[PDB]
């Protein structure tokens, strides 16, 4: 009767190439069959462990991920997106409820450092940071809906991220 769940570790749905992602399956097992079945898009993959680890993500790792065990039925789809760029604005989801926490992160490419970071909403500055820190909105309002992106300096390069559209619902 219980359904399995796929968790992303770290919580970000959108990753950049070369990033590490661990997809966890939460299900029930019986001593006879200890394996886990993983599904990429609609196709069965080779991983039989509790957690599927992607050491260095490629564009081919994008898509829907599902999992099931012998005692847990097929899980709901979990989407993973892989981008190529100097910067990326990450969030746990793109749809939030009102009074819900929003954790945004301005993530730069592997082995690169970022400074003079600016988080923007609808073309306007929300928060500036001299050094790379995350952007936290503990309680989301209806004023928090819109187009977000982050801009910063990777050494000398003035680079901006692609747009993420955040939707805020009431119920």
């Amino acid at each position: 009767l219980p359904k399995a769940v796929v968790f992303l570790e770290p919580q970000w749905y959108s990753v950049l190439e070369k990033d590490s992602v661990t997809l966890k399956c939460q299900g029930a097992y019986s001593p006879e069959d200890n394996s886990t079945q993983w599904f990429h898009n609609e196709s069965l993959i080779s991983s039989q462990a509790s957690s599927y680890f992607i050491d260095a993500a490629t564009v081919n790792d994008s898509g829907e991920y599902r999992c099931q065990t012998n005692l847990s039925t097929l899980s709901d789809p979990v989407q993973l997106e892989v981008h190529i760029g100097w910067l990326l604005l990450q969030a746990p989801r793109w749809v939030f409820k009102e009074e819900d926490p929003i954790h945004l992160r301005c993530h730069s490419w592997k082995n690169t450092a970022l400074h003079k970071v600016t988080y923007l909403q609808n073309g306007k500055d929300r928060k500036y940071f001299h050094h790379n820190s995350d952007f936290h909105i503990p309680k989301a309002t209806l004023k928090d809906s819109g187009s977000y992106f982050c801009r910063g300096l990777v050494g000398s390069k003035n680079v901006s991220s692609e747009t993420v559209n955040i939707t805020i619902t009431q119920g």
Side-chain angles (χ1 to χ4, degrees):
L1 210 144
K3 195 169 65 182
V5 190
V6 183
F7 299 124
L8 279 165
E9 191 129 295
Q11 56 192 238
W12 330 112
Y13 73 89
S14 192
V15 291
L16 219 42
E17 263 216 6
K18 288 190 173 180
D19 281 351
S20 286
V21 202
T22 308
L23 288 121
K24 288 175 171 291
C25 192
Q26 185 180 244
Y29 310 86
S30 57
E32 47 186 48
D33 193 26
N34 288 298
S35 65
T36 304
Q37 291 95 62
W38 282 95
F39 293 90
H40 180 203
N41 286 136
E42 278 177 282
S43 186
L44 176 78
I45 57 169
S46 301
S47 188
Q48 54 176 278
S50 183
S51 49
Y52 175 48
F53 183 56
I54 304 175
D55 57 341
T58 56
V59 191
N60 301 131
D61 292 308
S62 302
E64 296 186 320
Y65 282 87
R66 292 174 98 133
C67 73
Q68 60 160 41
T69 68
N70 62 117
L71 292 175
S72 298
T73 65
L74 195 62
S75 80
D76 283 318
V78 152
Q79 199 186 33
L80 182 76
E81 285 177 11
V82 187
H83 294 72
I84 295 156
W86 286 93
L87 269 185
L88 182 71
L89 184 83
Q90 299 176 308
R93 46 225 168 85
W94 57 98
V95 180
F96 297 86
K97 202 186 74 182
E98 220 175 335
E99 287 176 65
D100 253 15
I102 304 174
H103 190 172
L104 298 184
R105 185 195 198 97
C106 193
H107 183 54
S108 56
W109 191 260
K110 189 181 173 65
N111 293 302
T112 61
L114 188 73
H115 56 284
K116 300 204 168 186
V117 196
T118 311
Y119 286 87
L120 303 91
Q121 181 196 348
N122 298 332
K124 293 169 184 179
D125 298 25
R126 280 283 257 120
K127 216 157 191 180
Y128 176 75
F129 285 116
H130 280 109
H131 311 300
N132 198 35
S133 292
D134 294 353
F135 182 37
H136 311 108
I137 303 167
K139 259 191 180 182
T141 59
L142 237 51
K143 280 186 173 183
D144 293 309
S145 55
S147 293
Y148 289 78
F149 76 102
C150 65
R151 180 171 49 92
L153 281 295
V154 177
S156 43
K157 276 219 81 179
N158 218 304
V159 287
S160 298
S161 72
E162 287 171 272
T163 287
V164 179
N165 301 118
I166 292 173
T167 297
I168 305 299
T169 66
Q170 284 182 311

